[PDB]
């Protein structure tokens, strides 16, 4: 299938409680493979997946150096952001950044990302062209004019087209046993009455990888979109994910309901009923 590499940075100021915390995680698809935390005893870019551990001293030294540099830069950005928004120095604020690349089945760059936020709101985003910027407000427009003057987009694109794609491809090869393996959902339907008149049918998907999945209920073959309770996909802790979808049905009409499961691990979609 296709694949993505993403890094996620989180910087949070905490006045009176020392300098901003900087935490960084790296993912390939839905598999975390590195982390960095400035609040750790000995902050270093550290492995969180078996296939990354083979990388040598120079690797970890490099990545760590990047994380420390970025840490300092985003501490200054927090200061900068206070001035742009006319905010006081007593409040706690957060800068978030996500970036990375998507490749196709053949390892070709499908598209690149570089998005930043301030206090949970969009701040500035590299456009899909990797040459221009979308700024969310007049403060971000200030950053934009700085980044235009400095050919920042130019640098990003050279990364997203070069090192990002190359390293992702290397990771996909080093971790092929897992990163290139989809585990299909294990599926079943449960039934619990609410009253004389109504019963809950709940369609389960367990143990699947990657997280992307579609669970839908049809009644008489018609999607029950506005009528289905759909819980957030949740990690199991063993690499896999879980989800369910529930519908409230009239007692005696359970066989008019079917559950439909779409997932990459499944050759074709599955249809389930209550047994």
Partner 1 sequence: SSTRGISQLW
Partner 2 sequence: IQRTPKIQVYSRHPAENGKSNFLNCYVSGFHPSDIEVDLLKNGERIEKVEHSDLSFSKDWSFYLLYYTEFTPTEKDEYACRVNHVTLSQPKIVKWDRDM
76 binding partner 1? (CB under 8 A): yes
Closest distance of CB 216 from partner 2, Å = 19
- List the interface residues with partner 2, window 86-145 (CB under 8 A): 92, 94, 96, 98, 117, 119-122
Token digits for 10? 């989180």
Q: How far is CA 198 from CA 69, 102, 246, 251, 255, in A?
A: 59, 45, 13, 5, 13
Count the neighbouring beta carbons within 10 Å of the beta carbon of residue 125.
18
Choosing among partner 2, partner 1, none, which partner's interface includes residue 2 (Cβ < 5 to 8 Å by kind)? none
10, 70, 143, 174: residue in contact with partner 2 (rule CB under 8 A): 10
Q: CB nearer to partner 1: give 4 or 66.
A: 66
Choosing among partner 1, partner 2, none, which partner's interface includes residue 73 (Cβ < 5 to 8 Å by kind)? partner 1
Phi-psi region of 50 (alpha: psi -120 to 50; beta: other; left: phi over 0): alpha
Count the neighbouring beta carbons within 10 Å of the beta carbon of residue 267.
6
196 binding partner 2? (CB under 8 A): no
Q: Which residues contact 65 (CB under 8 A, 6 or more apart)?
A: none
Size of the site for partner 2 (CB under 8 A): 32
Q: Which residues contact 158 (CB under 8 A, 6 or more apart)?
A: none
Tell which residue, 262, 208, 263, has the closest CA to residue 236.
208
192 binding partner 2? (CB under 8 A): yes
Tally of CA atoms within 13 A in the half-sphere of 72 that contains its CB: 5
Closest distance of CB 198 from partner 1, Å = 53
- Separation of first and last alpha carbons in the chain: 33
Stretch that binds partner 1, among 158-166, 178-186, 194-202, 204-212 (CB under 8 A): 158-166
189 binding partner 1? (CB under 8 A): no
Is residue 270 a contact partner of residue 208, using CB atoms and an 8 Å limit?
A: no
85 binding partner 1? (CB under 8 A): no
232, 252, 255, 267: residue in contact with partner 2 (rule CB under 8 A): 232
236 binding partner 2? (CB under 8 A): yes
Binding residues for partner 2, rule: CB under 8 A, are: 8, 10, 12, 23, 25, 27, 32, 35, 37, 48, 92, 94, 96, 98, 117, 119-122, 190, 192, 202, 206, 231-232, 234-238, 242, 244
């Amino acid at each position: 299938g296709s694949h993505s590499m993403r890094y996620f940075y989180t910087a949070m100021s905490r006045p009176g409680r020392g300098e901003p915390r900087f935490i960084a995680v790296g993912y390939v698809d839905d598999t975390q493979f590195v982390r960095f935390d400035s609040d750790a005893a000995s902050p270093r870019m550290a492995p969180r997946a078996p296939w990354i551990e083979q990388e040598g001293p120079e690797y970890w030294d490099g990545e760590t150096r990047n994380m420390k540099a970025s840490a300092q830069t985003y501490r200054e950005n927090l200061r900068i952001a206070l001035r742009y928004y006319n905010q006081s120095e007593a409040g706690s604020h957060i800068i978030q950044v996500m970036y990375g690349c998507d490749v196709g089945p053949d390892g070709r760059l499908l598209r690149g990302h570089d998005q930043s936020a301030y206090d949970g709101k969009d701040y500035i985003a590299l456009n899909e062209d990797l040459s221009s910027w979308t700024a969310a407000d007049t403060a971000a427009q200030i950053t934009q004019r700085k980044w235009e003057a400095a050919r920042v987009a130019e640098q990003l694109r050279a990364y997203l087209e070069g090192l990002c794609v190359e390293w992702l491809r290397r990771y996909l090869e080093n971790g092929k046993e897992t990163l290139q393996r989809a585990d299909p959902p294990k599926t079943h339907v449960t039934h619990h009455p609410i009253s004389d008149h109504e019963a809950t049918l709940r369609c389960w998907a367990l143990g699947f990888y990657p997280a992307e999945i579609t669970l839908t209920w049809q009644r008489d073959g018609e999607d029950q979109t506005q009528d289905t309770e759909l819980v957030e996909t949740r990690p199991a802790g063993d690499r896999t994910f879980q989800k369910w979808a529930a519908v409230v049905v009239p007692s005696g009409e359970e066989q008019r309901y079917t559950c439909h499961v779409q997932h990459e691990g499944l050759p074709k979609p599955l249809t389930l009923r209550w047994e």
